[PDB]
């Protein structure tokens, strides 16, 4: 079970943690991946989660794309959690570095409402280029299910907690 989280709201929790290490410890029902529409898990959270699965996530993802085509920005799919979780919910937040509409971040977080409890990163943060303070705000204002946020960077975690309205 989840430990060491700071409660932000009734249903949103946050911890300064490596989401791969959190997933290996907790073995949650759902771990969220910060996916792109192609499910190409090259870097950021996706690269790290995929490497922890010994590339099994990428092999499964390539088969999913071959069958279904790319996801939509703001969309998601449920695939195996491999050795990390029961399921991985691959969610595509807008990538500001690709000029994608930041308004799609709320649609991306709405996918979390289909799961009672999730371990997740802040969508569109990191290499996706959005402001993580804004991502946390959209998360708290959109997700109604229990979301345990893992923030890798200690300095960012401190800034997120200290600026939380």
From Swiss-Prot:
Summary of activators and inhibitors of this protein: Inhibited in vitro by GRL-0617.
Catalyzed chemical reaction(s): Thiol-dependent hydrolysis of ester, thioester, amide, peptide and isopeptide bonds formed by the C-terminal Gly of ubiquitin (a 76-residue protein attached to proteins as an intracellular targeting signal)
Compartments (UniProt record): Host endoplasmic reticulum membrane
Protein topology in the membrane: Multi-pass membrane protein
Boundaries of every Macro domain copy: 1-165
Assembly: May form homohexamers. Interacts with N protein.
Cited function: Responsible for the cleavages located at the N-terminus of the replicase polyprotein. Participates together with nsp4 in the assembly of virally-induced cytoplasmic double-membrane vesicles necessary for viral replication. Antagonizes innate immune induction of type I interferon by blocking the phosphorylation, dimerization and subsequent nuclear translocation of host IRF3. Also prevents host NF-kappa-B signaling. In addition, PL-PRO possesses a deubiquitinating/deISGylating activity and processes both 'Lys-48'- and 'Lys-63'-linked polyubiquitin chains from cellular substrates.
Protein name as annotated: Papain-like protease nsp3
Annotated source species: Severe acute respiratory syndrome coronavirus 2
High-level lineage: Viruses, Riboviria, Orthornavirae, Pisuviricota, Pisoniviricetes
Gene name in the database record: rep
Stretch of the intact protein here: 1027 to 1191 of 7096
